[PDB]
């Protein structure tokens, strides 16, 4: 038997074609990805090959304005259009809560959405029962393939699943389901899931009976030979794991953002054992035409997008000053507004009052001379990187060193200068780098009345960073390797727009949070 696994992972609502770096498509003649282009390629493969199985490893929710406006309706609609055979729940599927997953995706998808390690509790148990399955036996050709899915144990920390969901160990939850498939006369089993490449290899080695592992959550690129784009492979495609039972299990990933379509041919024998496997991720560049019908549907749905983008989120009395000459050299209105948005979004970690933000994240200003109108387009211009604001736990010494790094190379107009909120920092550029932070006060937590007290090096603090800061971006290496706890949060533009819509008239000011001697 011969099976063709087509798979995608970590698409992140990349419905339209994107650039080479998966950003907004400027030059349409050199743009990759898209659900129309993916539809064209999948249609070609399905017309050419008898046994095809298009699988999704999750993280199809979130990433662009499509999810902001349609909140998962677009994802379910276009996976029904592309006719996915199965999906595994990613962490981002719980970003809008469990209610934001049940209604737009679980109740609207025409394919099984799977996770064997998510267990519901109490009131949610009856509401979500039957919406997601632990496994599914899909008939492919004349055979049956058992697909069992899994999700990260870190979903409670990376997302908002609720208090009624338990994410247990992937191995000890997949093994009973694989055995159940075995007693159901299914000998070809695919472990589809969203837990990262390392856990995919662990599942391949440990779970007995798994033939192929299709994963996500890691943005891992596997290629055999010379890669067709800027991605650097982390291993051969497929990555062959020698399981404890003596079998060679292929593990496959297809990078992210819909740029690639993983294509793996597996030849089975009569008993369901993988005789061999080979393939590659197909790069979806402009050489693959976009399907006219799916493109027309995207154009129809992309009107509501442009209608929502233009609408007014709120009024601004003041000039927001997102200019690079201000956000990278001194305190700016925009950094204070962004920090306030983070703090208010978190508080409304229930007592977190600290915020740092790299000035390289602020790209464009917002003009109040245009009748004081703020739109989604302006905020998207300010923060076009599509990141999220995450809660982290730091030490006083780590924050102090981060603030030294913030001004360790002042004058070069770099983006490491930090806008702060709930932090009063006074620098002194005259002294040598590494000691230029003369004064550093933070808002006290776990206290009746908040006040700005000097930062204690031996103490522990909770700070809202961007993903760039929490992952060693613009420098700040001492932050990424010293976080005690790190939990992902809400989107950047979403948080700022929510804060602006809550405060119908905003008037940020340079409050003296950052000072120079």
């Amino acid at each position: 038997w011969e099976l063709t696994i087509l798979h995608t992972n970590d698409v992140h609502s990349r419905l339209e074609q994107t650039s080479e770096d998966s950003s907004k498509c400027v030059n349409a003649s050199r743009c990759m990805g898209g659900v129309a282009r993916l539809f064209t390629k999948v249609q070609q493969i399905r017309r050419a090959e008898p046994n095809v199985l298009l699988l999704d490893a999750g993280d199809q929710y979130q990433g662009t304005i499509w999810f902001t406006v349609y909140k998962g309706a677009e994802v379910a609609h276009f996976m029904n259009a592309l006719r996915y055979d199965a999906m595994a729940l990613g962490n981002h599927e719980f970003d809008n809560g469990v209610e934001g997953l049940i209604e737009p995706l679980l109740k609207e998808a025409k394919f099984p959405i799977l996770s064997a390690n998510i267990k519901a509790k109490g009131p949610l148990a009856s509401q979500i029962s039957g919406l997601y399955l632990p496994y599914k036996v899909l008939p492919v050709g004349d055979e049956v393939v058992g697909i069992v899915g899994y999700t990260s144990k870190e979903t409670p920390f990376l997302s908002n699943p609720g208090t009624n969901l338990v994410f247990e160990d992937e191995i000890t939850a997949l093994q009973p389901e694989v055995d159940k498939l075995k007693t159901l006369n299914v000998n070809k089993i695919i472990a589809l899931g969203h837990s990262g490449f390392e856990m995919d290899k662990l599942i391949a080695q440990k779970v007995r009976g798994v033939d192929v592992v299709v994963g996500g959550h890691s943005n891992t690129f596997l290629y055999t030979g010379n890669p067709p784009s800027k991605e650097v492979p982390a291993g051969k495609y497929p990555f062959i794991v020698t399981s404890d039972d003596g079998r060679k299990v292929p593990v496959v990933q297809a990078y992210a953002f819909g740029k690639y379509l993983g294509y793996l041919k597996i030849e089975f024998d009569e008993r369901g054992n993988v005789i061999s496997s080979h393939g590659n991720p197909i790069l979806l560049n402009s050489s693959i035409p976009e399907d006219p019908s799916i493109k027309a549907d995207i154009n129809k749905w992309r009107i509501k997008l442009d209608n929502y983008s233009t609408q007014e989120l709120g009024k601004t009395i003041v000039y927001l000053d997102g200019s690079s000459q201000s956000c990278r050299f001194r305190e700016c209105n925009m950094g204070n507004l962004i920090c306030d948005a983070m703090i208010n979004n978190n508080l409304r970690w229930n007592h977190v009052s600290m915020c740092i933000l790299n000035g390289g994240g602020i790209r464009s200003p917002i003009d109040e001379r245009n009748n004081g109108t703020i739109t989604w387009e302006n905020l998207a211009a300010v923060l076009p990187f599509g990141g999220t604001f995450d809660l982290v736990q730091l030490k006083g010494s780590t924050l102090k060193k981060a603030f030294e790094h913030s001004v360790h190379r002042y004058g070069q107009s770099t983006g490491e200068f930090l806008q702060v909120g709930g932090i009063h920092v006074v620098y002194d550029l005259s002294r040598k780098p590494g000691d230029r932070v003369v004064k550093l006060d933070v808002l006290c937590t776990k206290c009746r009345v908040p006040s700005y007290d000097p930062l204690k090096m031996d103490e522990v603090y909770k700070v809202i960073l961007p993903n760039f800061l929490a992952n060693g971006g613009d420098g700040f290496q001492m932050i990424k390797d010293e976080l005690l706890r790190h939990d992902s949060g809400d989107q950047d533009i979403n948080v700022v727009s929510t804060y602006i819509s809550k405060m119908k008239v905003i008037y940020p000011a340079v409050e003296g949070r950052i000072k120079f001697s």
Partner: antibody, heavy 123, light 108 residues
């Protein structure tokens, strides 16, 4: 969402011809094999004809072979059944049905059926 | 043409009674069998598309089984909504013949 609408059925004199049409919506018409299925009043289902996505493989029942002609226009998302040399045995409700399989190489039955169009071949 | 036989022509059943319908092919059709349910005046609804694969939205009380020449449809804990006509259909190759049908009607 997936919807099939028949049309063109009606009263036919014996020995005459009639072209049934089926408009498809809510799915990629050029991805699925399409079938015409009879049901005479009071009797069960009878498979009339079937066409592949690219019209490369066409099948007829032995009772309609040499008389009926199935065809499809993927540009207009339409299915056509030209019935020729009709007789009283073809009086039935005709359904256009969409094959469940998205693979041209297999048949998984028919998962989407139309409302049916009644053809009454009687003098 | 692969002639297809279905037994019984009609079966009497009450609510909660297990119902078994057997479909037998002329030649081996591997596991390419479909089971449909038709109410009076309504289009047929696909219940089983492989020999045992359930269509989405179909209750788990419907089960398919069998392979090769003999196939079986089982309705455990029959419900009032299941009193209809049931058809088998071989999906091996053109022509795609249907079975005779089996009417499941309320026993009294």
């Amino acid at each position: 969402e997936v919807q099939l609408v028949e049309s063109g059925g009606g009263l036919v004199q014996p020995g005459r011809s009639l072209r049934l049409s089926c408009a498809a919506s809510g799915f990629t018409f050029d991805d699925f094999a399409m079938h015409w299925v009879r049901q005479a009043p009071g009797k069960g289902l009878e498979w009339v004809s079937g066409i592949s996505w690219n019209s490369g493989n066409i099948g007829y029942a032995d009772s309609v072979k040499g008389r009926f002609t199935i065809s499809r226009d993927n540009a207009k998302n339409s299915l056509y059944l030209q019935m020729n040399s009709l007789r009283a045995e073809d009086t039935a409700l005709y359904y256009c049905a969409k094959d469940k399989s998205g693979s041209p190489y297999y048949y998984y039955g028919m998962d989407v059926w139309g409302q049916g169009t009644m053809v009454t071949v009687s003098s | 043409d692969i002639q297809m036989t279905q037994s019984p022509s009609s079966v009497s059943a009450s609510v909660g009674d297990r119902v078994t319908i057997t479909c037998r092919a002329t030649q081996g059709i591997s596991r390419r069998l479909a089971w449909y349910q038709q109410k009076p005046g309504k289009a047929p609804k696909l219940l089983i598309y492989a020999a045992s694969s359930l269509q989405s939205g179909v209750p788990s009380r419907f089960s398919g089984s069998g392979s090769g020449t003999d196939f079986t449809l089982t309705i455990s804990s029959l419900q009032p909504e299941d009193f209809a006509t049931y058809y088998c259909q071989q999906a091996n190759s053109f022509p795609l013949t249907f079975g005779g049908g089996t009417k499941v009607e309320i026993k009294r």
